[PDB]
């Protein structure tokens, strides 16, 4: 479980992660990797 993985896509399927990954980069991107 991660602080960004818990919200947005809690449960997923390979072709949902692929588009989720685009939003996931907009959610945390660099964030000082904190």
UniProtKB/Swiss-Prot annotation:
It is found in: Secreted. The keyword Secreted applies. GO terms for molecular function: hormone activity; parathyroid hormone receptor binding; peptide hormone receptor binding; receptor ligand activity; type 1 parathyroid hormone receptor binding. It comes from the Eukaryota. Keywords: Cleavage on pair of basic residues, Disease variant, Hormone, Secreted, Signal. GO terms for cellular component: extracellular region; extracellular space. GO terms for biological process: adenylate cyclase-activating G protein-coupled receptor signaling pathway; bone mineralization; bone resorption; cAMP metabolic process; cell-cell signaling; G protein-coupled receptor signaling pathway; homeostasis of number of cells within a tissue; hormone-mediated apoptotic signaling pathway. Disulfide bonds: none annotated. Residues 17-34 are annotated as: Important for receptor binding. Changing residue 17 to A: Reduced affinity for PTH1R. Parathyroid hormone elevates calcium level by dissolving the salts in bone and preventing their renal excretion. Acts by binding to its receptor, PTH1R, activating G protein-coupled receptor signaling. Stimulates [1-14C]-2-deoxy-D-glucose (2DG) transport and glycogen synthesis in osteoblastic cells. Interacts with PTH1R (via N-terminal extracellular domain). Belongs to the parathyroid hormone family. It is linked to Hypoparathyroidism, familial isolated, 1: A form of hypoparathyroidism, a disorder characterized by hypocalcemia and hyperphosphatemia due to a deficiency of parathyroid hormone. Clinical features include seizures, tetany and cramps. FIH1 inheritance can be autosomal dominant or recessive. This is Parathyroid hormone. It comes from Homo sapiens (Human). The gene is PTH.
